[PDB]
Each structure stands twice: as C-alpha cells, then as structure tokens.
Amino acid sequence: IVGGTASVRGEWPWQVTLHTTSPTQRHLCGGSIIGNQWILTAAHCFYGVESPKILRVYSGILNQAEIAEDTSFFGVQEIIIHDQYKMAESGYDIALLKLETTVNYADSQRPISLPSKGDRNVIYTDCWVTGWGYRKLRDKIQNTLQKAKIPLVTNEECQKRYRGHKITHKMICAGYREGGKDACKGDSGGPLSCKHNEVWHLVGITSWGEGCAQRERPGVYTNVVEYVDWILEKTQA
Numbered sequence: 494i495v496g497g498t499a500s501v502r503g504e505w506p507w508q509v510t511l512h513t514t515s516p517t518q519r520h521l522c523g524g525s526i527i528g529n530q531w532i533l534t535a536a537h538c539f540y541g542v543e544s545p546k547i548l549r550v551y552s553g554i555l556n557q558a559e560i561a562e563d564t565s566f567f568g569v570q571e572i573i574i575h576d577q578y579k580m581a582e583s584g585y586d587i588a589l590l591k592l593e594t595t596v597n598y599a600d601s602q603r604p605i606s607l608p609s610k611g612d613r614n615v616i617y618t619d620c621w622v623t624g625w626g627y628r629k630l631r632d633k634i635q636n637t638l639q640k641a642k643i644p645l646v647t648n649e650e651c652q653k654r655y656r657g658h659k660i661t662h663k664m665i666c667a668g669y670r671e672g673g674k675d676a677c678k679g680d681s682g683g684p685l686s687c688k689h690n691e692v693w694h695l696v697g698i699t700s701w702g703e704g705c706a707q708r709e710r711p712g713v714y715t716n717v718v719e720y721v722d723w724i725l726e727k728t729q730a
C-alpha cells in the first residue's frame with residue numbers, strides 16, 4: 494500500500510495474508526474471508542504454484558512479525574481459478590481457496606459480506622484498500638498491515654487512463670487523479686472494502702495497475718459483484 498497508514502489491530506478482520514513455503518516461507522498475496530472455509534483472492538497470485546500444499550493462510554494478523562514457525566495457520570485443500578482467467582490485465586482475476594479446516598470466527602477474524610446485484614447503483618464514498626504490499630515501487634513486504642482510503646472512479650474515466658488496455662465492466666478502479674495512494678506489489682488478492690450503511694462489502698479484489706500510485710493511473714480491481722453467481726456455483730458442494 495502506497496501512501497497509507499498502519500491499521501488498527503482487528504480493523505480488517507476479513508483480511509488474510511497468504512504465504513507460500515517455497516523455497517522458504519514468505520508473504521505471497523492478500524485475501525478475504527468470505528466463508529468459514531473460503532478465501533476470495535486474485536487468480537494471478539498462483540502463478541508457478543503447482544500445488545496448494547505449499548500454501549498457508551493466516552488470519553487475524555496485523556504484523557507479519559506475529560507469524561513464526563509455531564504460529565497456527567489454515568492449510569489449503571483446493572485452489573479454484575476462474576476458467577476464463579488468463580492474466581490480470583485481461584480480467585477474470587479471481588480465485589477461491591478452499592481451506593482444509595474451518596475458520597472459527599472471532600473479533601480478530603470474520604467474513605466480509607459480498608456485494609449485491611441491487612447495490613450496483615450505489616455510490617461508494619468510503620472505500621479502503623489494505624495489505625502488506627509495497628510502499629514504493631522498490632520496497633519490500635511491510636510488517637504492519639497498511640490501509641488507505643481511495644475514491645472509486647467510473648469505468649469511463651478509468652479507460653481514459655489506460656489506453657491500449659480494455660477496462661471491462663467486470664473490473665472497477667479506484668485512485669486519485671494526482672496519485673499518491675494506491676495498492677502495490679504484494680497487495681494483490683487483497684480486498685477493496687467499502688462501508689455503506691454501516692456495513693462493509695467486498696467491492697473489489699486488488700489486481701493490477703501501471704506502477705503504483707502514479708498520477709492518472711487508478712488501481713484496477715476485480716469487480717466482485719460481477720462474480721457473485723460464480724462464487725455461489727464454486728462454493729456449493
């Protein structure tokens with residue numbers, strides 16, 4: 494996260510940090526708890542991942558420092574990548590992680606409600622992007638979960654900032670015309686939370702962007718509401 498600040502512990506209870514143990518353990522991507530055994534994240538986060546056996550999901554984390562060898566984690570039983578996904582910039586950057594065990598909700602870890610189809614006409618004026626991603630285009634995984642408030646931008650406006658690219662209705666953008674605040678390397682898979690009527694909704698999934706926080710370069714996110722049917726279909730046994 495560029496231009497953000499340290500989060501308060503438990504402030505984003507749905508946020509998880511997905512680690513890979515290969516070659517040695519490190520943070521890979523962000524993700525969101527949406528069900529007792531389901532994490533929603535970006536599909537482009539499993540590039541090179543041949544098995545879910547090397548994945549570890551940590552919930553209720555604020556500082557990466559809390560993660561040690563003796564720290565409990567959730568194993569991944571299955572990685573579900575949208576069948577139309579090819580690459581982030583082309584869209585369909587969405588994936589489900591079916592945990593090996595169930596998450597016991599608590600104030601430190603609880604699910605975020607998915608957007609509705611009747612809420613596609615709602616104007617989000619309180620959206621936040623979070624993660625342990627980069628702070629600069631040349632930094633490392635941040636220790637403390639960062640947060641940043643960023644305004645959504647219309648798709649027509651976003652398309653203007655991404656010539657040569659196709660910004661579809663299955664994507665959604667957020668950013669300041671002047672830049673300064675945005676997601677960055679490592680925030681991928683993270684949630685783009687928006688509070689409406691005292692209720693948080695998973696509006697987007699951090700996906701891509703030209704660089705980080707550059708002026709006239711809004712961050713691009715998977716437009717979750719366009720995948721509620723897919724999510725239902727893939728999560729039902």
Ligand SMILES: *[C@](=O)([C]([C][C][C][N]C([N])=[N])[N]C(=O)[C]([N]C(=O)C(=O)C1=[C][C]=[C]C(Cl)=[C]1)[C]([C])[C])C1=N[C]=[C]S1
Nearest residue numbers: 581582676677678679680681700701702703704705712
């Ligand atoms: C993700 O954490 C990052 C998150 C990008 C968010 N960026 C932003 N400005 N809001 N994702 C990536 O690094 C993906 N690639 C790009 O963003 C890349 O710069 C790009 C891709 C297509 C078109 C353009 Cl113009 C720029 C990803 C596809 C690698 C991470 N995901 C993996 C490691 S960090």
